[PDB]
Amino acid sequence: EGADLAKVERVAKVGGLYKNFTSGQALSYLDGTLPGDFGFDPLGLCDPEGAGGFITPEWLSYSEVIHCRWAMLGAAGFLAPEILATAGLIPATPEEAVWFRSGVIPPAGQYGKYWMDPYSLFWIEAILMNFAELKRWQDFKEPGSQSKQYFLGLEAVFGGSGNPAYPGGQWFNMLNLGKTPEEMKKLQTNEIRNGRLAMIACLGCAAQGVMTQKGPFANLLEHLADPVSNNLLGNLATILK
Amino acid sequence: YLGSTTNQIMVLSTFLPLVAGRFGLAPTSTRHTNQSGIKLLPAEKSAGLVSNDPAGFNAVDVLALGALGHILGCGIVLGLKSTGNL
Amino acid sequence: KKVKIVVDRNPVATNFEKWAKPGHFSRTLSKGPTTTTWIWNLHADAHDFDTQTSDLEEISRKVFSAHFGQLGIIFIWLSGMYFHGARFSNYEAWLTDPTHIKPSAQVVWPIVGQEILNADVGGGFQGLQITSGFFQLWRAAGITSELQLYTTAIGALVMAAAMFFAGWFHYHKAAPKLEWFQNVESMLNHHLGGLLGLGSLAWAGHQIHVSLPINKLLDAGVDPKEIPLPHEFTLNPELMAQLYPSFSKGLAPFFTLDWAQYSDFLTFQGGLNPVTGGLWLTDTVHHHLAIAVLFLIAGHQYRTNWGIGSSLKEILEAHKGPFTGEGHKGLYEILTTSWHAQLAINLALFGSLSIIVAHHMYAMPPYPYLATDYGTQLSLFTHHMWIGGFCIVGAGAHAAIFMVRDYDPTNNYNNLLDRVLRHRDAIISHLNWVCIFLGFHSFGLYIHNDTMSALGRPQDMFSDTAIQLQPVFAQWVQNTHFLAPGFTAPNALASTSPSWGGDVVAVGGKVAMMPISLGTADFLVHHIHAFTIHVTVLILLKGVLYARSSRLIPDKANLGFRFPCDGPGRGGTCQVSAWDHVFLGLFWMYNSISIVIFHFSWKMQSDVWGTVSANGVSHITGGNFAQSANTINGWLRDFLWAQSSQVIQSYGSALSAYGLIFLGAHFVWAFSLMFLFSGRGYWQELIESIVWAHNKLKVAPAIQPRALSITQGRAVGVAHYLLGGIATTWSFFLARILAVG
Amino acid sequence: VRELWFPGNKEVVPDYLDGSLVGDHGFDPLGLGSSPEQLSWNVHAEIFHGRLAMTGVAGILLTSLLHKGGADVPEWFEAGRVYLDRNPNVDFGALLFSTIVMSGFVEFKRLNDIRNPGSQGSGILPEDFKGVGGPQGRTVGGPYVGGRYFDPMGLCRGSPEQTLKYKWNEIRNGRLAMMAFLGFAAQYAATGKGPIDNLVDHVADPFHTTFVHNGVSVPFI
Amino acid sequence: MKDFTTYLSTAPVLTLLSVTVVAGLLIEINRFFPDALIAAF
């Protein structure tokens, strides 16, 4: 097989440690379209032939985009309350302002000063997310709907575009950025790279929280204090204590 | 722990098959053995694996050789510990 | 080439229109039920997907979705068991006093005087005494709570819904293509590592973080209410360090390969825990971790999407020797394109696995307080024995089916299948001679013993006190196992099982496991087992080998796998099909497993199970096996008549249901004799007379009533025979072992 | 066409739930009224359920308001035993059989209207009990009965758009009252108090009085 | 639901439901009227 020669320098042009991790199977369909396309698919999950259900290139790309957006929100929400409590701007103890002690896992920690208990908040969150994600799902299934039925006048901004990951109407692109297609592609690459970094960061924050029982900002400060002693191998003895 | 005898055994037992893999001394994702299992076939590229390594030493080869090296080094270290050496 | 996921989007529509019309799957069932034979054939060919479609892709998709449905049924069953353990069981009471409280997980509604079946099991609870061993398994897992059993039942219901959704999804929305099913390299790479290896590793993790601390506290002696919950044992290493001090240093000695410091909870002693009579749970942890590592290593043998790994076809085709010609040429193609051959192989090894499970679980109990409850022990052994024998017979059946249908002589020239088919007469004749020799030198020894006892010549019969027949090889193997620790097992502090030798393990006044001595009667019964196994092998192998053709009938493959006969000619060709060979092998497997479980129950009621009195062991029957199991009158009297007094005097008690089933199964077994001995023509003519009676009163059904077909009659007879015999033995065993012990 | 129960999404059931029936928004995911005869039967059942639940919910609300006002009026979940205690001369089987018989008379009238839409407007009953039809295109019988007896104010005789508006009012209020009675039963099961009691308890204390605080819905908090 | 009701009208579903309702009726008869050896009026 030996790849296709001319399909490989496209991955070599984006530099970095790519091409070392791409394959001939991946480059059959990963031909430079879609943002973030660096040829990395060793398992062939986005092979268009025989693709159905959720193992499908447009569904997988959509899942990547909204996963990376949710992880950007999650990483910023992990690193904001602790960096505000460390500075003393908020009246929260930094051991309490840790993200997993905020009531998401009551065994891991509780915050009883919310205006409701977490189950009521989850009930209304379930209703609201059910609204939002089901309208998003039906717009994915029918990429022209959600603007034909009345929604207190909010349906005008739910037309979307051809790509389900990029509606960009009057609300989803209110400031109108990326006027010209190459700028839009560049900012899409910005978004996907930032979001995949944030996915790695969210996984790392979970692993550090299990590993050190402290916040990610606290772990960063302890690592910067003494990197030789405070690392993964140096914290391997005291992990859940 | 760094620089200990078991650390030296682990780094050697992980690094030596990695070196033997690239230079054709060990089986590779592109270089296999035939029915006999002694002689090594010439490098063949139907897997479609590419790398910036000039000899074609793929990341899959790195993972496989490091896996086997870790298995062998763990066996060696645990054998030397049980005998009373190390 | 290139292992990948390939599916078809929406192949089969989801609606109820084919539910209205039965028999839609096969063309031969069309145009309505003209006779009741149509009704019987509709159920007969429901799962015969080869007769439904000729496409291997559709057959594979149907098999996949049927597997999902079966998994959903098993999950519903598990949810029901956990729900009954939660709601209608004395599990918490049994946890406080496992030695005296009889396990129970099913209660009955007082309707017709059936509330007498609610036994006085103990713990202030009334219900049927269960023999399935769920209580011991849950105690081993470290439950010790009612709410957790209910949570597991709900989770199993959710998993059943997931299984059914997966089956519907993979038949109706995304059905995999044929080449997806043929990725046997990837399937083995994922079943070795991701299924078995990861499952063993995950169970080792659970046992480390849940089973070890809770069961350690239970063995030290603590009421389960004040035991810390599993999560807080898992949450911090502090309590774990109090119970197992190696957790104070955490994962540091693991990654530095100083694994010897984990020896407090990763142990290797052998024997049994004297508090419970089960295996050491640290030993089970070490076992599961070791086999998980081994299986994850085994999961990288085969080549998938990368150049490393060996292909199954290449390994097969290169194993050719001078005695066998081409060797394994064609085995890869007849196993990646025929489902029946894979079913035969998997059923054979699955039944052998079930039998091995039965053996290894009586020999050395893995769950706490499983040895002391003799009822669940005997029931578990017997159940796994019967499942193994059934699966083995099914393996023979599906090997015969593959030989009839999916065997192509073009791609099977001069290979092992061809070599075996070309000298089938030698194999069958030699197995016949072995069966006759074993039958003589096993049964005739018993008959000689009967004759000498009845002639008043006890010095002339084969026995330990007269003409000895000692199992010297088996006794020496026991000695080798008993002497293994400290010699050939230097790191073992005790032997694997007390059956090899040593001291009697007693828990709560009852013997957990004690050494088993082999004498003349054990020699005779082992040779009887060999004879029965050999005859069952003879019938199944003869059916498989002569399914294709024969000297008598050269075109048996044309007539199919399941046909009654080829007429009264050639002297008579009744039961020449491989199906009838399975039909006879079912009876022979029944005979074999029945003798095996009889030997098991008598041997351990006479030499293993019993009570301790600080001066000896008082067995259930009192050592009568060694002097009565060499005589058929001894089996009839000292085992089959002496132990039957518990089931026939069980009326008016909680074992009255066992007493009733003991007679109902006799009725079913003798009801089988109608179908087994009679023939279709008589019943057809009698049905003609009854049809005349119906015509006289205008009550004739439009669907013509026909006598059961010859294969139908044989199947009904063998089903009733095996059901009646197995249920008779089940009622006898359970009543006897729950009334005395 | 019309506003659906799930905006967008054109797999709405084939043209038996077209935009003709009152209250039609294409909501039949289980296909429980796929066949036309079952569809007509279920339209009758839905209209009857809506009217009955509306009457029941109005009665429950009024008796719960009167109970909070200090009147000698029991709550809805205990009115039967209160009536039997206040009136010991009434046999329970007596009242139950009388209810069965009287309800059965009018229910067999409605049933024979369902079987034959035009058969109940003659005989002993006058022509006003013929019915006016509506569902499935027919102009006789059905759940909608005109006349000067079941429409004595005549609010759906004249101005067809007024009739359509009032029918939409009736079907929406009936579905809302069915869900209201479901909520009444669930709140009684989870709290043990009346509907108005629950409403004023939640209005007095918005927080710590939701469904998670009763210990029955969430079974551990 | 025509095909679903036709499936419910099929012989095995109807005979299982019929023996279920008959057995349940007999069981509740014995629940409310137990130990009825004879038809004593």
Ligand code: CLA
């Ligand atoms: C156990 C048998 C089984 C098998 C062999 C398959 C096989 C397959 N499924 Mg499938 N599935 C199953 C069960 C199974 N499924 C069940 C029980 C459900 C219901 C939940 C589903 C629901 C399902 C959907 C909705 C889809 C598939 C699809 C597919 C196909 C591609 C999936 C893939 O490989 O990509 C990768 C698979 C994943 C990324 C999932 C991994 C993570 C999930 C959540 C499982 C994790 C459970 C894990 C074992 C638990 C470990 C412990 C953990 C809590 C830490 C593939 C042929 C896709 C298809 O349509 O075909 C193309 C598809 O969209 N399946």
Ligand code: CLA
């Ligand atoms: C740094 C991450 C990042 C980047 C580079 C992008 C980039 C893009 N997004 Mg995206 N998005 C992100 C994060 C990001 N997004 C996150 C975390 C979410 C989840 C909430 C979303 C959800 C989202 C949706 C739903 C949509 C987009 C769309 C777009 C495209 C429209 C052009 C644009 O306005 O750019 C964005 C410009 C920037 C990110 C730079 C500004 C950064 C400042 C500091 C943050 C502004 C926040 C501000 C203070 C709050 C008030 C806003 C305003 C009232 C002042 C563009 C390529 C639309 C689209 O696809 O068009 C077709 C669209 O439909 N995004």
Ligand code: CLA
């Ligand atoms: C690590 C990956 C993995 C795992 C864990 C499994 C696990 C399983 N497979 Mg599967 N399979 C895999 C990969 C995997 N497979 C691949 C890559 C292929 C393509 C070559 C297949 C093709 C295949 C076929 C054709 C069949 C199976 C079957 C089975 C089941 C065996 C029967 C049983 O009762 O076991 C024990 C039961 C359990 C352990 C219960 C746990 C069940 C959970 C849901 C397992 C989830 C694993 C799943 C792969 C996760 C992805 C699905 C996700 C979208 C939800 C079992 C659960 C057989 C079956 O029964 O069909 C369902 C069967 O017919 N597999």
Ligand code: CLA
């Ligand atoms: C993994 C297990 C497995 C699987 C998947 C199959 C699959 C298959 N078998 Mg098979 N078989 C198996 C194990 C298995 N078998 C075992 C263990 C045996 C030994 C008993 C057999 C013996 C066997 C024979 C002799 C035959 C098959 C046949 C078949 C094929 C058609 C089955 C059918 O639709 O007939 C209909 C299935 C039924 C009518 C189900 C009812 C069967 C009995 C009556 C159920 C037993 C009663 C049960 C215990 C409940 C008792 C309580 C009661 C009082 C209520 C099919 C592909 C047939 C074939 O032609 O192959 C192509 C064939 O004749 N099998």
Ligand code: CLA
């Ligand atoms: C215990 C063994 C047994 C039993 C019960 C029977 C029973 C019967 N034989 Mg038979 N027979 C037997 C052995 C047996 N035979 C043997 C070994 C032979 C030699 C081959 C014969 C040869 C023979 C011949 C030649 C004839 C009979 C006939 C009959 C029927 C006679 C009518 C009658 O008496 O009604 C009694 C009914 C019963 C005993 C059946 C039991 C009642 C059932 C259990 C009730 C159903 C409840 C429940 C739904 C069961 C299903 C459970 C399931 C759904 C889970 C009858 C059904 C004659 C016949 O056909 O009559 C017209 C006939 O001509 N028999």
Ligand code: CLA
């Ligand atoms: C028992 C009362 C009842 C009945 C008979 C109907 C009947 C009907 N409805 Mg309606 N509906 C109801 C209540 C009812 N509805 C309520 C309370 C609401 C508000 C949530 C709605 C909202 C609604 C909408 C938006 C629409 C309909 C529509 C329809 C029509 C087509 C649907 C169909 O054929 O399925 C038949 C329905 C049933 C057979 C009753 C379902 C009962 C199930 C089997 C029980 C489970 C549901 C229950 C809530 C679960 C909890 C029970 C228990 C645990 C407490 C049909 C004539 C569609 C239409 O075209 O209007 C004409 C449509 O657009 N309904």
Ligand SMILES: CCCCCCCCCCCCCCCC(=O)OC[C@H](COP(=O)(O)OC[C@@H](O)CO)OC(=O)CCCCCCCCCCCCCCC
């Ligand atoms: C978690 C278990 C395994 C996960 C496998 C499944 C995940 C698949 C992800 C694979 C990578 C995908 C492609 C990567 C391809 C890739 O890497 O992209 C290249 C990456 C950035 O590339 P860009 O996207 O910026 O490319 C644009 C530029 O190249 C322009 O020329 O550069 C890096 O190498 C960053 C990574 C350095 C990481 C520094 C961490 C150092 C810690 C070392 C720890 C090991 C030793 C520890 C000893 C104590």
Ligand SMILES: CC1=C[C@H](O)CC(C)(C)[C@H]1/C=C/C(C)=C/C=C/C(C)=C/C=C/C=C(C)/C=C/C=C(C)/C=C/C1=C(C)C[C@H](O)CC1(C)C
């Ligand atoms: C590429 C590829 C291809 C080939 O072929 C194959 C393979 C290898 C498979 C691959 C790879 C893959 C991967 C790497 C994956 C991963 C992912 C991730 C990590 C995600 C995350 C992701 C993540 C995410 C979303 C996250 C999110 C988060 C969140 C929301 C959070 C939230 C929160 C906050 C704020 C805080 C508070 O206090 C709490 C809470 C509430 C909790």
Ligand SMILES: CC1=C(/C=C/C(C)=C/C=C/C(C)=C/C=C/C=C(C)/C=C/C=C(C)/C=C/C2=C(C)CCCC2(C)C)C(C)(C)CCC1
């Ligand atoms: C010279 C050169 C270089 C270098 C490179 C390198 C050096 C690389 C590497 C790397 C490495 C150094 C790697 C490693 C590896 C390994 C692995 C990745 C593995 C694995 C795994 C496994 C398989 C394990 C297993 C286990 C467990 C799990 C636990 C217990 C024990 C055992 C063993 C069993 C550069 C480019 C810079 C520059 C130029 C040239």
